[PDB]
Structure formats: C-alpha cells, structure tokens
Amino acid sequence: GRQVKTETYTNTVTNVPIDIRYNSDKYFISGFASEVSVVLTGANRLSLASEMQESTRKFKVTADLTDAGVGTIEVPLSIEDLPNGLTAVATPQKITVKIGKKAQKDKVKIVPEIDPSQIDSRVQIENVMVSDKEVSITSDQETLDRIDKIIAVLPTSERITGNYSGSVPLQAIDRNGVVLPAVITPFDTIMKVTTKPV
Amino acid sequence: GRQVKTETYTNTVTNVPIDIRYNSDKYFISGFASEVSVVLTGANRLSLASEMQESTRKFKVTADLTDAGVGTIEVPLSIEDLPNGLTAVATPQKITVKIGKKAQKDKVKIVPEIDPSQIDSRVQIENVMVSDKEVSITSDQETLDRIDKIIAVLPTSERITGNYSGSVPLQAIDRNGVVLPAVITPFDTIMKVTTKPV
Structure with a gap:
C-alpha cells in the first residue's frame, strides 16, 4: 500500500574510459581524468556481473565536444547502451575540458x-x-x-x-x-x- | 610466382579511449593522452566500416599497470577483440604513465x-x-x-x-x-x- 523497502544490488565499476567525440585534427584537449567509475544498481545480479566484467560489458560512457569551441568548459557524461533493469551514475557526472587549437x-x-x-x-x-x-x-x-x-x-x-x-x-x-x-x-x-x- | 602488389583498404579511427587496468584505490595515475588513434588495414571494407563506427565497434585498446609499482614508466598498448582479416596499430603504440600513491x-x-x-x-x-x-x-x-x-x-x-x-x-x-x-x-x-x- 505505502512505501516498502525492497532488496537491490550495487557495484562500482572502476577504470571506465570516456569516449570523447571531438575533431582531433582541429582541436587539442586536456585537463580531465581519462577514466571514471560507474555506480551500477539493479535486482538482476547476473546482468550486473556481466556489465562489471570488461569482456561482456555493453555500456559506454561518452562526452560530446562538437558544439563547444575553444576555451575551458565542463561537459556532462552520458551512459549509452546500458542494459534494461539497471541504473548507472558516472563518478564524476561531468568532466572539465580545456579545448585549444x-x-x-x-x-x-x-x-x-x-x-x-x-x-x-x-x-x-x-x-x-x-x-x-x-x-x-x-x-x-x-x-x-x-x-x-x-x-x-x-x-x-x-x-x-x-x-x-x-x-x-x-x-x-x-x-x-x-x-x-x-x-x-x-x-x-x-x-x-x-x-x-x- | 614472385612478390605481387595487392589492393587493400585502410582507415585511421580517431578518438579511441584506452582501457587502463590498475588499482585506482591504491594508486593515482597521470601524464598520458586519454585517447589514441588506431590505423586499421584490411581487404574487407564492410568489417573495416563497422569497426570504424563506435556503435558496431568490437576492438578495444588496453594497458596493464598491475605489474608496475610507483614511478614514471612507459607501457605497450594492446588491441583486444579485433575481428579476423584486419590489422590494427595504435597511434602511439606506447603511453607514458606516472604511477603515484x-x-x-x-x-x-x-x-x-x-x-x-x-x-x-x-x-x-x-x-x-x-x-x-x-x-x-x-x-x-x-x-x-x-x-x-x-x-x-x-x-x-x-x-x-x-x-x-x-x-x-x-x-x-x-x-x-x-x-x-x-x-x-x-x-x-x-x-x-x-x-x-x-
């Protein structure tokens, strides 16, 4: 009837590389950590385990810099191709990038x-x-x-x-x-x- | 009979993130470029195209720091899960990492x-x-x-x-x-x- 406490599982996936989209022939970028941690949450332990393992991992953390120009800016990270029944939060959620010519x-x-x-x-x-x-x-x-x-x-x-x-x-x-x-x-x-x- | 010139295709895949394996709770790493370029070569244009596209990409560039201790070191990059009939060379082949406590x-x-x-x-x-x-x-x-x-x-x-x-x-x-x-x-x-x- 009301708000009931339910049992779910969690795992922090470490060493997750960021797939940054930008024109690497026109711009040079720096000032951010190459890898992040992803906090996964879900009732299905099996999907959680396979998503933690690099071999059977389907999710990817991405960033897009195409809209931005020169100068230092912070961009939000996106979790793409995450399997259903799971919640993913990147650590940190945003990265600071110095875009220079x-x-x-x-x-x-x-x-x-x-x-x-x-x-x-x-x-x-x-x-x-x-x-x-x-x-x-x-x-x-x-x-x-x-x-x-x-x-x-x-x-x-x-x-x-x-x-x-x-x-x-x-x-x-x-x-x-x-x-x-x-x-x-x-x-x-x-x-x-x-x-x-x- | 002798050495004959054959027709093959090539593509340099840009913005390829490195999957660095290391204990991120005991060590802090810096001093390397987060992303690399991968030179792909093969006669099959279709596999080359799908491997260039981030969505249908199967290959991954990795680095292992588990053996190394503290201090600055250069480690060779590895191309894993590359489809058959293709040749991949990372640009650069090795990355310089400053491993600190x-x-x-x-x-x-x-x-x-x-x-x-x-x-x-x-x-x-x-x-x-x-x-x-x-x-x-x-x-x-x-x-x-x-x-x-x-x-x-x-x-x-x-x-x-x-x-x-x-x-x-x-x-x-x-x-x-x-x-x-x-x-x-x-x-x-x-x-x-x-x-x-x-």
Missing part, C-alpha cells in the same frame, strides 16, 4: 635526465647519448609557448649499474620543470649511457 | 577567477560568492604538496552582463598558476556574481 612545433633541445638514486655507488657516468636529435610536439598554442626543454627521463624502475642502452620516454617541461600536457613524436628515444667504474 | 587533502582556499574580457564594459562587479567553502583533492603526494590554491574559474563561453548564477568548474593550481593533475570533489561549485551598472 591544435598547434605543433619542432624542438632540438632534448636533455637526458637520470636521478642520482638510479646511479650505482661503485659506478661513474662518462657520457649520455640520445638517439633522437629532433622531436615534434603537438598541443594547444598556450602550453606550446610555455615549453622550455624536452627531457629523455630514465624510467624509475631502471638502474645504472654499467653501460646502459634502452628506450626512455620523452616529456615536455617548462622553466620550472613542470610536465606540460603535450603529445611528443617520437613518444620515446634510445638512451645510451657510457660508464667508468670509480 | 593515491593521497588526499582538504582545502578551504577556494578563489573565484573571472577574465576581464568576460566582464561587460557597462557592468561593474560588486561581490563574487562561491557555494562550496571546503573541497577534497585526490592526486599523488608529489603534486598534492605543490597545490597552492583551488580556483572556481568561470567557463570561457560565459559572459558577465549582470547578476550571474551558475556552475563553474574547480581547478587545482600551484604558486605559478599551473593546473595540476588532480581530482577535486565536488568537481564544480555554484558561483554567484553581484553587479552594479557603472
């Missing part, structure tokens, strides 16, 4: 970076070679102007115990050393470290 | 930001109110320490022509005014602008 610039100032913790105590570095001498950077004009140096930083997991040769990622930083939102081509380079034993 | 901090220093271009010439701002007085920030400990102020920036598309009331996104910036990779809760706030006509 896609601009590119080439840089030759490629600096290798190695943390003294990665260098062994009984090893002394002689020379550091970087295979790529020129790189292309894609970003908005605002952050592109703020690029000071391109760095070929050694992965945190790697250690210099002697002569090293391996692929190191390339990052675009400003005068203060802040990693700027930019796409570098090539995305990595081969770093060769020559060492002398103390 | 998930840390949170609450801030009360919420500053509203309005660009003088958004303010009308015949209008003068009297008072600016922000509905939220306390916000929670989620990020790595490194960038969390670098947070100076939380800003309630007015969207670029919006204009102050009189008394305004609307949702404005919240951003975490450092002493130099750089938007830092962090998740703010609430993600936005209601900004109320009181105005006097010159």
